[PDB]
Assembly symmetry: C2
Homo-oligomer: 145 residues x 2
């Protein structure tokens, strides 16, 4: 509910993303990220990373999602996009959903290092685990490497 520091489970766990209802959309960022400095800027920062990564036209309609390990992210719904990261020189082709996961990972890791806020670090580890279980894990890990 609040992306608490307490783990729902330890050990091995099947991770699942669930769309945030339209009713609860507006409360998403403070509810899950409100302990982190500059949380109101995270959504703009994700779109910023997506613009850096996108080779030509990406676009889409973006939704908000929660994870059953306490994580949370934004992406288009689960057509392919080509991304390119200049920091590592890699190109990768992937679904709009996977691209969104990739943009959020980059956002969370960068912002954790800037703020030294462990709550941001935990969001990174939680989404990273979802990426590690994802059918397009190889492409996601390639682009963020």
């Amino acid at each position: 509910t609040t992306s608490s520091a307490c783990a729902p489970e330890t050990g091995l766990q099947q991770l699942v993303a669930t769309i945030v209802p339209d009713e609860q959309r507006i409360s998403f960022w403070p509810q899950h990220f409100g302990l982190i400095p500059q949380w109101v800027t995270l959504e703009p920062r994700v779109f910023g990373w997506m613009d850096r990564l996108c080779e030509n036209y990406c676009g889409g309609i973006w939704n908000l999602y929660t994870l059953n390990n306490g994580g949370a992210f934004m992406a288009p719904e689960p057509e392919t996009w080509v991304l390119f990261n200049a920091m590592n020189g890699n190109r990768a082709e992937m679904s709009p959903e996977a691209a969104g996961i990739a943009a959020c990972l980059m956002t969370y890791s960068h912002h954790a290092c800037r703020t030294e806020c462990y709550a941001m670090t935990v969001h990174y580890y939680r989404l990273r685990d979802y990426a590690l279980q994802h059918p397009e894990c190889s492409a996601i890990m390639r682009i963020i490497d």
Copy 2:
């Protein structure tokens, strides 16, 4: 010494390094000192080993993690999930630390403790005894 900055993306190769005798005394405050009730972590690890069971060595990890493990195969039992598993004293220590860290994160709502859980957990994932470790903490 412990940073909220996590640079690893894919599955990085992790190494555990024993803490030199000289640096033993400063281990707990250096790695856990910004966490409420950090002085309780050592006795709580000893307690989880008592519960699960069997000198301790202190270790640091190259992802910023840290743990301790005692120095044969032991049989552990966790009443929380009803699982039993055979493993080395090192593996048992890793298991005891993972339970201590996860529980203290819930107790304190301190995210640095959650990060310690993840960092040690990733070492367990690449450990030869991953299956036994993950089973006992399921």
